[PDB]
Design a protein around this ligand. Structure first.
Ligand code: SF4
Ligand code: ZN
Ligand code: ZN
Ligand code: ZN
Ligand code: ZN
Lengths: 752, 374
């Protein structure tokens, strides 16, 4: 349809529209017009991506500013979904407007997902792919080939072919999804990875993950290309704090330090070899360093620094190199003794928690390394590696971690904490000391985003409570509200089971994981629900270890045998590819009527973007509250930091952290208002957590379902499933849950 | 932490404490609105149905008295009697699903008695094993292969399980069914099944109203009954043609003679007008010349499906009325402020509530319309 807002014409790609979408669209426009940040929570059963793209894209095309749009997701899978939705809108707009307006939309991901090279795309890790692509695209091969054609160094045909054409002609006007982009590039032998990166500045809407916006290692390059007045959208940002924290975190192990020493020795040997034969390169680099130039000046735009910057760009010193690490040999000695200091600190016998300031003071005591040279460690190492002709960097890879540690610890002093534990795994014959550099304040990584950009929209399906996020992340919002879906007939049945058929309490507490009574009760619940669930049944466990243990007990007890009769069993695995294969098989079984049951982790890869709409998801079995591991040094330190700074109680945050993951999994079963399913939370502790659930889920949770039994819950599930199968009366939903064009005009007139 | 005992007493006696004629009509008025939409849709009178029944472990449940198997078989016997009564010139086939296999229990034939005997025998065996839609659909596809192009190939499936185990790819079978122009109706028992919904939708030109799930035993009888009526044909699916069939003449002989169909001595039979061979009963295909033999009564049974009687619209009490008694039965209309008169627009004659149901359910001609001379 094509309806009107106060002054903005927006073309919706569907003939019908939900009341929630119009209200959601109206609120977004007001936020953009008034400027500022907002937190909008909408039910997962109503089209959110289409509504966001429809209004935002219409907003830029109409207003003179023509503000660009920045869409941020949490995983690459969501990027493709948004792009497909993005393609849907433009196709509809092109048909309605009679012409294809000038519009460019691209997604941005890593080389691993966009490498068409037959030999470089067959790797099992993105780090190796980047190194090989850089070798063929750094420019050393091209320069060597130009000087001497006989050189055996190879190039990438896809990268070379781009130089023939101009940047503006890399792709035709329109929206190119990853599936479409690869097909188009393959037919013309071009590199999608370089096409998108060189084309970000020309895209009306650019879609990437949170890591490309929060992680300084890869954010700085992309952030420099995007505009400053563009619209920023945070989709599914209910776990944005975790992304922010991990952006400035590091872990060091005894093996890493041992490998670092080998790399340091190799660098010293290489420097000696270069000195004997080619000493002019060292002098040229030294002369530039004395002047005061940094990696940005020396390095060409075609090449990239060896060590990605680990700190935010605003925290990088703009002064010259301190001088202690100005020369190659002196820097190596500086680097070497730093590694030795780290090694001796790993021989502790008890957990030691220390602030960065204390660590620096002790370092300045045992050795004579000052704070300022450490801040330049990563910057200096990249220059040295660049000038040493290091075509193979397998040995020097370990030194990247050491350089990252030095810059991070010497840069930040507040909101960061260093943990040294003699036992990485408490259940180990021999101690395995580990050193963890942790970020406690999640607002540090997101602070630049909220200041650089004027308008930011934070939206998700299960972002509740909305007050905590402004508290946890230091920002203020013009408006924050949650919508309640106006569904004529209830489509989702949320229930809480506090005990089994025997009436014995059931919980997923780790200390009682190996309990015959609790395990059997959960297994009976799993079997009983599989009996009545028509097509698909998804089960989420608090942790992978709990799933591994409980599943094994079920196999011995014979519970899995009963499940095998009615549904195929697919289990999430640590290997990403195997889990993806399981999802394909799980979907195939549901489609063909064989029936399948998927066992996954509530905090795993499946829960972070994979949706089970319609037949795939009909019953969600939440086995316990997905609580974190309480006896963790990282979590305890963060809890204390939040308590002292933001006055957030430790118990409150723990409940909030677990509930958001439980709700996250709950909301991955509804796509439209015709989708239905049953959501069961199996733990005695969910009973008092009704107020903590999202508003649209709490509304559907009745008082009688606060504490149910396995037998009682099954009876309700059977009755609910039977009712949902009946033909819905159209008149019951003509203008109360779905609106036509005429109905929308009525709403506008009545409100005005 | 006090228990519920100390709180108070339930006091059940407190719960209970100590226009109507208009309500009875408005419900009747609303119900007449639902049936007001009647149009002469084209229907395929000649049908070829393959009744598929589920006999698996899931059919041993006690949801339906006495069990799903017994009730479904019991209703199946009822379905055969009603189907052939209103579709005399159609044929039926019966298949069952047992032990993950499709078992043929009745070949395609126009004799209702043969099907009844097969269903009665099935009533004894205990169901078990897993169901297999692909096995049943493949068998149904084969059974419908030797059918003329003018007949409507249909398959009614009574599914009771929530899962299906198949040896091959079900989607390929669904595609073949669409290519063969077979139409599938599924009557589920417990809940929607993803494959069943796709089968009913893609096989019926996208219509999603052919996959029905009951809510009680009363509704199940309605679902079975609704399938007896011929299914309207699609516009773009044209198979118009002329079918050669004859009208035999009954005889009354003094001595018995062998029948050309069963090779059995029978006193009286109908002589085919093409080869003079005698057949015990009708309607059946002649065993010699392969020419369908039917009586004029059989054709007349389907006229009402081609010229449905237009619904009767209520008359508001504001206007005056013609007569105080029903035109057809002269049943005095109660005064009751509401009216019970139903008028036929074609003839504008008042009818009582009793006749209106009878005229549109038992009879198929408006008594007033016939009396009216043009
Ligand atoms: S230029 Fe593109 S195709 Fe070639 S190796 Fe690099 S990422 Fe792969
Ligand atoms: Zn005979
Ligand atoms: Zn004959
Ligand atoms: Zn009457
Ligand atoms: Zn009449």
């Amino acid at each position: 349809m094509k309806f009107y807002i106060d002054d903005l014409p927006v073309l919706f790609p569907y003939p019908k529209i939900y009341p929630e979408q119009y209200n959601y669209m109206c609120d977004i426009k007001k936020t953009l017009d008034v400027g500022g940040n907002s937190i909008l929570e909408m039910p997962s059963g109503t089209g959110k991506t289409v509504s966001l793209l429809s209004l935002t894209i219409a907003y830029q095309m109409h207003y003179p500013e023509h503000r660009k749009i920045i869409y941020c997701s949490r995983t690459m899978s969501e990027i493709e979904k948004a792009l497909v939705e993005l393609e849907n809108l433009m196709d509809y707009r092109t048909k309605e407007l009679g012409y294809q307006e000038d519009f460019r939309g691209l997604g941005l991901t890593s080389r691993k997902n966009l490498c068409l090279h037959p030999e470089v795309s067959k790797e099992r890790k993105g780090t190796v792919v980047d190194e090989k692509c850089r070798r063929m695209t750094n420019g050393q091969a091209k320069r060597k080939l130009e000087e001497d054609p006989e050189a055996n160094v190879e190039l990438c045909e896809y990268h070379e072919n781009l130089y023939n054409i101009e940047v503006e002609d890399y792709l035709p006007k329109g929206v190119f999804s990853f599936e479409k982009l690869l097909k188009y590039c393959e037919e013309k032998t071009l590199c999608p990875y370089f096409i998108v990166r060189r084309m970000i500045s020309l895209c009306n809407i650019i879609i990437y993950s949170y890591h490309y916006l929060l992680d300084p290692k890869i954010a700085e390059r992309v952030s420099n290309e995007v505009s400053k007045d563009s619209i920023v959208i945070f989709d599914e940002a209910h776990n944005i704090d975790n992304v922010c924290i991990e952006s400035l975190s590091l872990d060091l192990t005894t093996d890493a330090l041992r490998r670092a020493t080998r790399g340091a020795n190799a660098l010293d040997e290489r420097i000696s070899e270069v000195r004997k034969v080619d000493s002019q390169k060292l002098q040229d680099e030294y002369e530039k360093l004395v002047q005061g130039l940094h990696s940005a000046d020396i390095l060409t735009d075609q090449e990239e620094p060896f060590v990605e910057t680990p700190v935010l760009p605003q925290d990088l010193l703009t002064e010259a190199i301190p001088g202690n690490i100005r020369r190659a040999e002196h820097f190596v000695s500086f680097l070497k003794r730093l590694i030795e200091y780290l090694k001796t600190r790993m021989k502790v016998l008890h957990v030691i928690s220390e602030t960065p300031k204390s660590f620096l003071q002790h370092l300045k005591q045992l050795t004579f390394i000052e704070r300022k040279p450490l801040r330049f460690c990563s910057e200096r190492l990249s220059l040295l590696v660049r000038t040493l002709e290091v075509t193979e960097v397998e040995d020097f890879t370990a030194l990247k971690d050491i350089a990252t540690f030095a810059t991070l610890i010497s840069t930040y002093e507040e909101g960061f904490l260093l943990i040294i534990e003699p036992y990485e795994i408490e259940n180990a014959a021999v101690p395995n000391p580990i050193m963890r550099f942790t970020c406690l304040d999640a607002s540090i990584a997101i602070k630049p985003v909220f200041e650089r950009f004027s308008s930011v929209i934070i939206t998700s399906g299960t972002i509740s409570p909305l007050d905590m996020y402004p508290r946890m992340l230091n920002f203020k919002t013009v408006l924050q509200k949650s919508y309640a879906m106006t569904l004529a007939k209830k489509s989702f049945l949320p229930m809480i089971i506090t005990k089994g058929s025997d009436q014995v309490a059931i919980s997923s507490r780790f200390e009682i994981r190996n309990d015959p009574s609790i395990v059997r009760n959960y297994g009976s619940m799993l079997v009983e629900f599989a009996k009545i669930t028509p097509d698909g049944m998804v089960v989420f466990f608090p942790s992978y270890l709990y799933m591994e243990s409980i599943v094994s007990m079920w196999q011995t007890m014979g519970i899995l045998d009963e499940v095998w009769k009615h549904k195929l069993i697919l289990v999430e695995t640590p290997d990403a590819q195997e889990t993806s294969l399981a999802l394909e098989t799980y979907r195939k079984a549901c489609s063909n009527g064989r029936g399948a049951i998927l066992l996954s982790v509530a905090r795993g890869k499946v829960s972070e973007g994979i949706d089970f709409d319609h037949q795939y998801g009909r019953t969600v079995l939440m086995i316990g509250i997905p609580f974190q591991y309480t006896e963790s040094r990282i979590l305890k330190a963060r809890l204390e930091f939040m308590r002292e700074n933001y006055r957030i109680r430790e118990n409150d945050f723990l409940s909030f952290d677990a509930m958001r993951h439980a709700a996250q999994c709950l909301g991955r079963v509804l796509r439209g208002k015709d989708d239905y399913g049953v959501m069961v939370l199996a733990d005695r502790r969910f009973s008092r957590k009704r107020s903590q659930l999202p508003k649209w889920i709490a509304q559907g949770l009745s008082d009688a379902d606060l504490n149910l039994s396995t037998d009682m819950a099954i009876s309700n599930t059977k009755q609910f499933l039977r009712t949902m199968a009946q033909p819905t009366d159209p008149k019951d939903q003509e203008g109360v849950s779905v609106w036509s064009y005429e109905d929308l005009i009525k709403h506008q007139n009545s409100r005005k | 932490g006090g228990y519920a005992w100390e709180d108070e007493i339930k006091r059940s006696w407190d719960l209970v404490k100590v226009a109507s004629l208009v309500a009875s009509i408005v419900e009747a008025r609303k119900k007449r609105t639902a049936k007001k939409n009647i149009t002469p849709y084209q229907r395929g009178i000649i049908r070829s149905l393959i009744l598929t029944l589920d006999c698996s472990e899931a059919m041993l449940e006690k949801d339906l008295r006495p069990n799903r198997h017994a009730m479904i078989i019991q209703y199946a016997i009822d379905f055969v009697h009603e189907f052939f009564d209103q579709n005399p010139i159609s044929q039926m086939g019966i298949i069952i699903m047992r032990n993950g296999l499709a078992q043929l229990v009745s070949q395609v034939s126009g004799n209702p008695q043969d099907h009844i005997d097969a269903l009665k025998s099935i009533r004894k065996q205990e169901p078990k094993g897993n169901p297999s839609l692909q096995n049943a659909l493949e068998m149904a596809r084969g059974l419908l292969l030797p059918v003329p192009a003018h007949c409507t190939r249909e398959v009614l499936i009574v599914f009771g399980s929530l899962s299906t185990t198949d040896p091959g790819d079900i989607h390929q079978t669904i595609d073949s069914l669409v290519s063969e122009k077979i139409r599938v109706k599924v009557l589920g028992l417990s809940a929607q099944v993803a494959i069943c919904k796709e089968l009913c939708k893609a096989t019926n030109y996208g219509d999603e109203s052919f996959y029905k799930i009951l809510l009680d035993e009363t509704h199940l009888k309605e679902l079975f009954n609704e399938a007896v009526t011929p299914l309207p044909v699609n516009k773009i699916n044209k198979g118009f043609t002329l079918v050669k069939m004859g009208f035999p003449t009954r005889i009354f002989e003094d001595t018995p003679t062998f029948c050309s169909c069963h090779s059995k001595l029978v006193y009286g039979g109908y002589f085919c007008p093409n080869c003079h061979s005698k057949v015990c009963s009708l309607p059946t295909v002649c065993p010699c010349c392969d020419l369908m033999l039917i009586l004029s009564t059989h054709l007349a049974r389907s006229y009402h499906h081609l010229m449905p009687l237009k619904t009767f619209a209520e008359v508001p009490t504001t206007e005056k009325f013609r007569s105080e008694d029903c035109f057809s039965c002269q049943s005095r209309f109660p005064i009751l402020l509401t009216s019970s008169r139903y008028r036929c627009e074609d003839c504008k004659q008042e009818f009582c509530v009793d006749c209106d149901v009878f005229i549109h359910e038992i009879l198929h001609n408006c008594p007033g319309c016939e009396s009216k001379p043009v």
